[PDB]
Design a protein around this ligand. Structure first.
Ligand code: HEC
Ligand code: HEC
Ligand code: HEM
Ligand code: HEM
Ligand code: HEM
Ligand code: HEM
Lengths: 74, 237, 47, 370, 370, 74, 237
């Protein structure tokens, strides 16, 4: 497979420019950083809470294990 | 178990090297103390060159000790003074003799023991300096001794080290501590004869990869800039 | 003896050899420092 | 004119909405070639004899000119290898590669080829975890009735591990990457009839673009990060993953108090260790892997991806907790605070896959009426 | 659908005037796979250490269940291998395969891949001809000025052959067949755009026929003859070609009175041994092989084959006398009745190729006016 | 490449039969053996004489070599 | 050089095997004669099972000889009666002792000597039975001896064998010849423990391949028969 016999296209225009006629990193800080946060606010709630529990189960996994080797009053 | 602390060192830093002066006194220890019952088989005097001793000087130690080499033309074997190619004098010919020389217990090798024990140095330095009186309600056979860092807190380790157990060349203090410093410095070199060079490539890497990585990241953003700035439209009737 | 993984081969009439008559004109003591201690890499020159 | 087949790596149509994740899809080609290249030069001084192999490693790390690096570019390279895969594979779930049934199965046979390969690679140096690391796992195949004792003794070259066990792996281990090297092309062949598969999951036929400027350098950029994250470990923390014990000589007459194989089994080893029964967990082990062949009959949603299935993301990243848990829980010993976990975590693994991901599409279709 | 590429071995056009010679064209696929298959199981008990390797062979021939055969199915298999080639290659001259310039060069790189491979295969058991068989040949590369001492010491892993020399070959030797295994496909690829080449030399496009019934079984019939001629030797005369000395342990401090490598070098080794000068014959050696790349600029006749060039047959079968002579003259020592031969036979080899075969077509064209 | 677009053919007929309707080896001895000899008489003269000399050079190569190790009268 | 003849044998035929009765007396020879100075290291008593001796009987010889095995718990080594797993008693611990026990000359091993010497058996049998008085005009150092079959015709081979040098079990003649027969029969078995089985597959092969080869040659001629009988013509206008 290659270009030429994939599918159909009709009434579509494409504009584009050389790289040399534009800076590589414009608006990186200015516009990127909100887009990072917007990318963040859409994903954290479905990614973190597993790892949140993991941090806790990693915590309680040690403490209970830590106590068990410590003796009892007898 | 018992977790040793993270004692600092002259080499803990990720571009820190070993104090070779500390190694120079460290090697004295292994010969005077540990070489009676520890079989370091993966090392020779020649590896000490460029590290702590010179060619001729370290060779003077090869002249010191006898080594079993050479089938005589009679068909027998003999003893000669060693050389720089010769590995260290093995204390005992086989493990079982070491168990026999002890209370049934074996000395491990000390070539790669550092990297083969959790914590490495910090285990060892605190091991020797963890001797104390046993606690109440504990009992031990003869030959065994107490040391908390060892698993089971029960070991056939005779105390090898103590203050003023020997003397060193330049004349620094022969405390139980400074000696314990050079020796652990010494053993890390055993399982790492490359430390002086690992950091060298340890450093060359960064000022290249830290320098390339933006540039390639730019050449990426260079080519992709056509599509990072590409617009469209839709003009049917 | 064995050396570099190669062999190690180690006077009254030896000096009697006429050097010019030989193939390689080469006096004996040009090859050694001591006369009575001979050394050479023991490898046949041909093959 | 073999220049027309190498258009698949030069002039191939491929999408444009592509993340940085798919760097990982080609790093294996770099890991594999590098790893082979490393190991090949590495085996110039390995020895397949018990009495010298462990020493023959020491022949490298001490006496070879800059060869000591090669033990670690290769060894910890094998860790960076696996770090790609479980970022390469969970991808296919988070994006929906697995509909390409002719390809997804190939993606399995590699894994069992490797995870049975790597098992033969940790064992060569006779580390005192090599031996027992080979004992425990291989001992399990005695779990089968009436043949388990045969095949195990048959592979041990006797009645227990020995010199004869070693050489039989070193050839089986020096070889399979080449078998992988060709299967790699096969894995790309069935692709070639259909091409890649965007994050959205949409058939992006309209927006397929060239490959030589764009994704080439993009992969090289990833390879840089790989070499970086590889050069870091070897230079700064080579003792990190490769356990300390493996520098010990082998001795069957003494064990460590704690056993664990290399870190990457541990999600899987823990599943077995959960089961007190012997055989009752073994079949769960390979089933935990071979479930991947069984997933694509569970693509309930008539969508593909999971960027457009928010509930799937709630489950999917929850699965990672289980694996990363079983990873850690596996590498820790058998005691009451931990047994209670694996008896759940093992079940959770099978549960999330075969109940709730299907349940999603059956619902999400109903949430939007098809 | 990887079923369409395997039509080249099922539904491929190919001629119909085909002899029994072209059995040999595919036996290598059977020799190679068999040889690999043999050697792979064989290396399950080889050891890459001087102190045990020769013994590790004895571990096979005595203590392994029917493994003793495998030393010979492999070893003498390598002789039957070469028997195919110089019946496979002289073919291309007697029929005119060599016009396919894109293929003929590939047919060379195999040969130097193998003849440098096999050189690493005779040496493993430390036979007292292994050592010197590796010494003499490798020593010659000191013939170069100002680098010869470097590369040779560089490959010897020191200043002379040793344990370090061994392992470096065993990996270089366990590997190249796989490199050949893929180059085999390449060798068939450039073919695939043009197909085979009849004995007549005529473009037989009109009479190209299927492949699954006809040439499949025909090759199998040849494979039978191969397995026969292989099973015969191993069962009835395994000591025939493999020289007796190689069962001796290695010792640098003593040589045999007579040296010769394995029989197949001997046409080539004799060419060098003819020259009293050191370097003046070395360049002739590889030139004697690499002349094959230089022949196709010497296809003077505007015909192709030699079934229709009777004079070429007078020369061609005369060349075989020279090779089969240098074969025997090579394996015999340096004395006056034999030096007089190789000083001619070596020149005859270069002479028949570069003077008289060209001269034929320049005449045969004139004998028939074009 | 495959069947279909190789070349041109015109006015050619092909007759052929099943294998089952004919013995595999008819006239093997009766007709083959002359054809063997005919195949022989066309090739021996351009194949043998090299090997003829080889047999002689293989002969004289030994005899002269055989004599040389045998001593001379002196 | 000297070319030995082609003496016949009980095993020269391409489906002929070894007279195991001849082997049984042959092994007596190596122990009584050759095992004083020949180091056969690639063999054990167990390989004699199913060949010349049984398990218990051959084991009686392992009980006969002492063998150095086992690190004592003290850390030393000792001697025990051998077993079937144990290889043969090596005469001397190293080669050099053998050179010292001789006039500077070494005994070769005899495991694979047959296949490592042109002619194999026929060399060896004629070697022992090629001793004669030296010819006129020849001189030899002490310890050296004359034997034409050896290269250089000069050898430090003390005559090992002679008529009535020992006696055998069943009581056959202890001539210099019959003994020389069993011993060469014995050594061929050394470098071929498979002879009894090589011919077995040596035979199974033929009555298969001799049986298949026509059939495949027919299936060939079967399919090709379409073209072995194909006719043509040419009918344009
Ligand atoms: C009395 C002979 C002897 C002396 C001297 C000696 N060692 Fe030991 N070493 C032993 C024996 C015996 C053991 C066995 C310990 C055990 O079995 O747990 C041992 C154990 C060790 C270990 C193993 C630690 C472990 O986890 O088991 C280390 C490290 C060590 N010694 C270091 C040293 C150092 C450092 C010195 C000098 C300060 C030293 N040795 C001097 C005999 C000795
Ligand atoms: C007295 C000790 C001794 C005895 C007993 C002995 N050998 Fe030898 N053997 C030697 C020595 C020493 C050599 C060295 C020959 C040389 O250096 O050329 C040798 C050489 C040989 C060789 C080498 C032949 C070759 O082609 O290289 C063979 C074979 C051999 N012996 C077999 C035998 C046989 C057969 C017997 C009994 C008939 C026997 N040995 C008994 C000491 C012995
Ligand atoms: C996917 C492929 C492979 C995997 C998963 C793998 C696994 C491993 C691992 C993890 C080690 C570490 C041993 C250590 O650090 O001490 C190792 C060592 C080794 N590898 Fe492999 N390997 C692979 C391929 C290869 C290849 C391709 C070669 C040779 C071309 C090779 C030859 C060796 C040798 C000789 C060792 C011993 C060195 C040592 O143990 O340190 N391996 N293998
Ligand atoms: C050496 C091992 C492997 C190699 C060389 C390899 C190679 C590749 C490459 C180059 C791609 C295209 C890059 C991309 O799609 O992002 C790809 C895609 C893919 N791989 Fe791998 N891969 C390997 C292992 C695996 C494994 C273990 C799986 C397990 C499931 C797998 C499953 C897939 C799938 C399903 C795709 C399709 C990509 C898509 O759907 O867009 N591969 N493989
Ligand atoms: C064209 C490919 C090869 C050639 C020309 C070749 C050559 C040889 C030869 C002639 C021997 C005979 C040694 C003997 O008879 O004692 C040998 C031995 C050996 N071959 Fe190779 N070989 C090839 C491929 C392989 C392969 C593919 C393997 C493993 C898969 C292998 C592994 C070995 C080993 C371990 C030995 C030692 C056995 C012995 O020396 O008897 N070789 N090789
Ligand atoms: C492992 C090694 C090789 C393999 C697997 C291989 C494979 C093949 C096969 C299957 C054929 C078609 C059969 C035939 O044409 O009769 C062929 C043809 C051919 N081979 Fe080989 N071959 C090998 C080595 C060589 C070598 C060493 C040469 C040296 C010149 C060579 C030169 C050729 C040429 C020129 C042809 C064209 C056949 C024609 O013109 O009709 N090949 N090869």
């Amino acid at each position: 497979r290659q270009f030429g016999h994939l599918t159909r296209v009709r009434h579509v225009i494409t504009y584009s420019l050389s790289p040399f006629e534009q800076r590589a990193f414009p608006h990186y800080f200015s516009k990127g950083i909100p887009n990072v946060l917007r990318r963040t606010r859409a994903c954290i709630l479905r990614v973190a809470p597993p790892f949140v529990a993991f941090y806790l189960v990693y915590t309680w996994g040690t403490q209970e294990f830590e106590k068990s080797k410590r003796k009892n009053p007898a | 178990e018992l977790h040793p602390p993270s004692y600092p060192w002259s080499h803990r830093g990720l571009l820190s090297s070993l104090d070779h002066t500390s190694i120079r006194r460290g090697f004295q220890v292994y010969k005077q103390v540990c070489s009676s019952c520890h079989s370091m088989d993966y090392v020779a005097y020649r590896h000490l060159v460029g590290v702590c001793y010179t060619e001729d000087e370290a060779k003077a130690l090869a002249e010191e000790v006898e080594v079993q080499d050479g089938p005589n033309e009679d068909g027998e074997m003999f003893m000669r003074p060693g050389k720089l190619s010769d590995y260290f004098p093995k204390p005992y010919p086989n493990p079982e003799a070491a168990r026999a020389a002890n209370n049934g217990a074996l000395p491990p090798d000390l070539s790669y023991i550092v990297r083969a024990r959790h914590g490495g140095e910090d285990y060892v330095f605190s091991l020797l300096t963890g001797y104390c009186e046993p606690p109440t309600g504990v009992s031990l056979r003869e030959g065994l001794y107490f040391n908390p860092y060892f698993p089971g807190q029960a070991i056939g380790m005779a105390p090898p080290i103590y203050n003023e157990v020997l003397e060193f060349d330049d004349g620094t203090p022969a405390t139980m501590s400074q000696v314990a410093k050079d020796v652990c410095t010494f053993l890390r070199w055993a399982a790492e004869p490359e430390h002086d060079h690992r950091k060298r490539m340890g450093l060359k890497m960064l000022l290249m990869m830290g320098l390339l990585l933006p540039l390639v990241y730019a050449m990426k953003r260079h080519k992709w800039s056509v599509l990072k700035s590409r617009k469209l439209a839709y003009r049917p009737p | 003896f064995k050396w570099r993984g190669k062999p190690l081969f180690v006077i009254d009439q030896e000096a009697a050899v006429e050097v010019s008559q030989l193939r390689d004109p080469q006096h004996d003591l040009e090859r050694v420092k001591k006369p009575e201690w001979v050394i050479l890499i023991g490898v046949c020159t041909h093959l | 004119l073999m220049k027309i087949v190498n258009n698949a790596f030069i002039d191939l149509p491929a999408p444009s909405n592509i993340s940085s994740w798919w760097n990982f899809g080609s790093l294996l080609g770099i890991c594999l070639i590098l790893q082979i290249l490393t190991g090949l030069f590495l085996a110039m001084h390995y020895t397949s004899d018990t009495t010298t192999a462990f020493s023959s490693v020491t022949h490298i790390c001490r006496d070879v000119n800059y060869g000591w690096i090669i033990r670690y570019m290769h060894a910890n390279g094998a860790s960076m290898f696996f770090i790609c895969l479980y970022m390469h594979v969970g991808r296919g779930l988070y994006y929906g590669s697995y509909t390409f049934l002719e390809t997804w199965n190939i993606g399995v046979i590699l894994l069992l080829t490797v995870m049975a390969t790597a098992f033969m690679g940790y064992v060569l140096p006779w580390g005192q975890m090599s031996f027992w690391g080979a004992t425990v796992i291989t001992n399990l195949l005695s779990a089968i009735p009436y043949i388990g004792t045969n095949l195990v003794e048959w592979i041990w070259g006797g009645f227990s591990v020995d010199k004869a066990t070693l050489t039989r792996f070193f050839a089986f281990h020096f070889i399979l990457p080449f078998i992988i090297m060709a299967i790699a092309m096969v894995h790309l062949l069935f692709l070639h009839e259909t091409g890649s598969n965007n994050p959205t999951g949409i058939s992006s036929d309209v927006d397929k673009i060239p490959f030589h400027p764009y994704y080439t350098i993009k992969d090289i950029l990833g390879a840089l990060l790989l070499i970086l994250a590889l050069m870091l470990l070897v230079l700064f923390a080579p003792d990190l993953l490769g356990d300390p014990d493996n520098y010990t000589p082998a001795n069957p007459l003494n064990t460590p108090p704690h056993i664990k194989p290399e870190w990457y089994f541990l999600f899987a080893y823990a599943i077995l260790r959960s089961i007190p029964n012997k055989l009752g967990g073994v079949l769960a082990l390979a089933f935990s892997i071979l479930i991947l062949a069984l997933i694509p009959l569970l693509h309930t949603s008539k969508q593909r991806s999971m960027m457009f299935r928010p509930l799937s993301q709630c489950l999917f990243w929850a699965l990672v907790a289980d694996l990363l848990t079983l990873t850690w829980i596996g590498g820790q010993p058998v005691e009451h605070p931990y047994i209670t976990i694996g008896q759940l975590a093992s079940v959770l693994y099978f549960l999330l896959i075969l109940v709730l991901m299907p349940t999603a599409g059956t619902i999400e279709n109903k949430l939007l009426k098809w």
